[PDB]
Design a protein around this ligand. Structure first.
Ligand SMILES: [Zn+2]
Ligand SMILES: [Zn+2]
Ligand SMILES: [Zn+2]
Ligand SMILES: [Zn+2]
Ligand SMILES: [Zn+2]
Lengths: 199, 48, 255, 84, 156
């Protein structure tokens, strides 16, 4: 227990660029959001005259099991979320490496005490296999490569791409993606003639 | 009364001039040395 | 633009709503500001206030200090400080979303901490395990004071209300169930529009109960669940694949 | 206890009867759960509640894992379509 | 002895000339302690900032009478200190060399803060402004927590 508690792991993006920080240790501050159990909360600030105060939110058991930061919840090596890291590890070697997430407040404070390094952190907790899968991502990346009535809108394109292109080809927009009746409406008929002229 | 809140000092008490304490009236010459300070708070607080 | 004028005061401090709410039960509790010996299952009401995004928004005190966060009470419609408010008093655009990117992983746009899992009923703040962008609008029949209104017009009013609070990826109103699913393009607009349009109405002056809109319950904006539409699932899988390829490019370039 | 077990049994039967009637009507009322009597009372479908892993040895269990996962997924789909 | 009891002494000479202006501060303090209810937190700090401002101004009045323009007798000024119309310690800080425009006595107390240093109102304005211009953001200190002081340096 707490007579030898490990030091925290704060992301280098979270600590900031100032070469000297002071952070406050409160030996039982908040309780952990993943772990439901007390820990020693740290609350630093990036520069001295920054506006907002960064504080750690998860336990050190809970941070090490996911191999993540405490302030940021991002993977400590690649600096990406857990849900995208598990997709990249799962897409390459085909293991479904997905992280198991416990409800039932007894079960989450049960899981936080075992020391197993949860799903996708087993690779990036070691530098060797974490570099090997980047070598494989090289191979996958190499094998990879006034009122107008619109019609034949692609079934998965949203409204804002249409509006951003019209703002480049220069308002309102009502697009029902089912019926594809893209009822665009400009604010001036001069702007309608403008858009007719540019196409 | 049990349902009366305690009245505020700054309104009901502080603006009233106080009343007369006990103060046994001393003689003028038989009690000459202690008359001018017997009933103070700290009787010779500033007399070095 | 909002960069020109300083942010107007929305409501005075004296004209704020009081505490000690509503006289629901018999005896009032002090440690919790609620009513006891009571009966309560509704406890909802139409919010008196609402923001007007072109009239109210402007520069503030803590915009010159570069604060990341947006004012909760600017959104809800009752910010009583104006040009003196510490937080931002404008709709989140691309530039403000680009600055929050280190902090939106953990906490809100308003600066509130995201919990591990949502709620029993998909309540207020999000969950930090999932970047949800689609909002569930419901309770529309209480929001319209039971004015049946030919559902394409209801979808038009839900289109117009949320068109001012940011960019919209897509809109859907459901015929069978009085609900709508609104997907924004960024997350901070979804958070802002959720807290901005809770407990509001859909009525607007030429609608014959505009003088009587204050009675009722008002609508619910909550978080949408996962979509069981297989077209939506395949679209989600394709978008996940393209995001995966982008992050593959960046991770290879960082080696 | 005998009496309460019989009454809870018939109560569950009525609770499924109304759901099957509404399923025939076309409105799918999901089954409500029993309420917790205390704050950390445990639901037993959310998680394997005290999951103990079998501490792996020298032999390899990838293909048998895949074969079990196939069999269980196929059983759940068959109960969903046909109903046990 | 702020209340007037039997133990008090009668006033010296010039007090009846300066009795009305001091009276103004008295009635203005009896607007400030009056419990106007506010829901916010900053708006509940504004009240205490107003009270500390009124106490500071009354002490500046008695100080600028006795020390600067020498307009009242020493025998009256000792009475005004005795009857708590003035703060003896705040005037004692005003008589120093580095401290003349001092707001209150919690902005020079080193023990109260997290790390040593005084309150930020004690800094000159130009030094904060050159550091804020060096980092290029802007100077973000509007109003102190303890007093509401906005730059109480001696040069400012
Ligand atoms: Zn923990
Ligand atoms: Zn505000
Ligand atoms: Zn000061
Ligand atoms: Zn001060
Ligand atoms: Zn100060």
């Amino acid at each position: 227990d707490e007579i030898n508690e490990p030091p925290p792991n704060i992301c280098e993006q979270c600590l900031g660029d100032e070469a000297n920080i002071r952070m406050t240790k409160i030996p039982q501050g908040s309780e952990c959001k993943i772990c439901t159990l007390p820990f020693t909360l740290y609350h630093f600030k990036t520069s001295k005259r920054s506006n907002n105060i960064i504080k750690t939110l998860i336990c050190v058991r809970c941070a090490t099991q996911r191999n993540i930061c405490q302030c940021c919840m991002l993977d400590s090596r690649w600096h990406i979320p857990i849900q995208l890291r598990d997709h990249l590890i799962s897409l390459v070697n085909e293991e479904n490496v997905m992280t198991e997430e416990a409800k039932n407040d007894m079960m989450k404070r049960f899981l936080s005490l075992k020391n197993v390094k949860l799903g996708g952190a087993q690779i990036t907790s070691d530098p060797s296999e974490a570099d090997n899968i980047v070598d494989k991502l090289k191979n996958i990346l190499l094998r990879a490569t006034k009122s107008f009535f619109l019609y034949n809108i692609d079934a998965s394109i949203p409204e804002w791409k249409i509006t951003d292109t019209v703002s480049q080809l220069l308002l309102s927009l009502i697009v029902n993606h089912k019926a594809k009746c893209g009822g665009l409406r400009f604010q001036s008929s001069e702007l309608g003639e403008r858009f007719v002229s540019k196409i | 009364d049990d349902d009366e809140p305690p009245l505020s000092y700054e309104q009901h008490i502080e603006n009233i001039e106080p009343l007369d304490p006990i103060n046994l009236p001393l003689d003028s010459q038989d009690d000459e040395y202690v008359k001018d300070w017997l009933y103070d708070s700290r009787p010779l607080e500033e007399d070095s | 633009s909002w960069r020109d004028k300083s942010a107007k005061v929305q409501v005075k401090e004296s004209e704020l709503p009081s505490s000690i709410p509503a006289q629901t039960g018999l005896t009032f509790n002090i440690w919790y500001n609620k009513w006891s010996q009571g009966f309560a299952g509704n406890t909802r009401f139409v919010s008196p206030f609402a923001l007007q995004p072109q009239l109210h928004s402007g520069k503030t005190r803590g915009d010159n200090d570069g604060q990341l966060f947006f004012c909760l009470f600017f959104a809800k419609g009752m910010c009583c400080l104006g040009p003196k408010c510490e937080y931002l008093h404008h709709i989140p655009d691309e530039e403000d979303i680009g600055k929050l990117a280190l902090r939106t992983e953990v906490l809100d746009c308003f600066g509130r901490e995201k919990f591990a899992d949502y709620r029993e009923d998909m309540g207020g703040i999000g969950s930090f395990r999932k970047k949800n962008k689609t909002l569930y609008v419901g309770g529309i029949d209480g929001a319209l004071n039971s004015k049946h209104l030919k559902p394409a017009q209801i979808e038009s009013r839900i289109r117009f209300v949320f068109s001012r609070l940011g960019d919209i990826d897509r809109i859907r109103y459901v015929e069978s169930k009085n609900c709508g699913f609104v997907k924004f393009k960024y997350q901070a607009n979804a958070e802002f529009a959720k807290e901005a349009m809770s407990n509001q109405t859909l009525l607007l002056p030429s609608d014959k109960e505009w003088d009587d809109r204050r009675e009722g319950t008002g609508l619910l904006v909550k978080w949408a669940n996962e979509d069981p539409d297989p077209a939506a699932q395949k679209r989600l899988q394709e978008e996940l694949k393209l995001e995966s390829l982008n992050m593959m490019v960046h991770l290879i370039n960082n080696n | 206890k005998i009496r309460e077990r019989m009454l809870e049994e018939s109560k569950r039967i009525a609770e499924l009867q109304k759901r099957r009637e509404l399923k025939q009507a076309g409105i799918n009322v999901a089954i409500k759960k029993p309420k917790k009597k205390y704050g950390t009372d445990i639901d037993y479908n959310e998680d394997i509640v005290y999951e103990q892993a079998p501490m792996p040895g020298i032999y390899d269990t990838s293909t048998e894992d895949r074969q079990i996962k196939k069999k269980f997924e196929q059983f759940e789909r068959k109960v969903n379509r046909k109903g046990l | 002895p702020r209340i007037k009891t039997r133990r008090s002494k009668p006033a010296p000479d010039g007090f009846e000339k300066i009795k009305p202006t001091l009276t103004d501060f008295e009635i203005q303090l009896r607007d400030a302690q009056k419990d106007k209810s506010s829901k916010l937190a900053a708006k509940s700090n504004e009240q205490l900032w107003e009270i500390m401002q009124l106490h500071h101004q009354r002490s500046r009045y008695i100080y600028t009478l006795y020390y600067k323009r020498k307009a009242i007798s020493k025998d009256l000024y000792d009475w005004l200190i005795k009857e708590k119309y003035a703060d003896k310690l705040l005037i004692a800080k005003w008589r120093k060399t580095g401290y003349e425009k001092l707001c209150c006595l919690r902005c020079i107390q080193k023990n109260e803060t997290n790390n040593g240093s005084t309150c930020i109102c004690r800094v000159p304005r130009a030094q904060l402004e050159e550091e804020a211009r060096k980092k290029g953001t802007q100077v973000s200190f509007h109003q102190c927590v303890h007093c509401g002081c906005r730059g109480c340096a001696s040069t400012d």
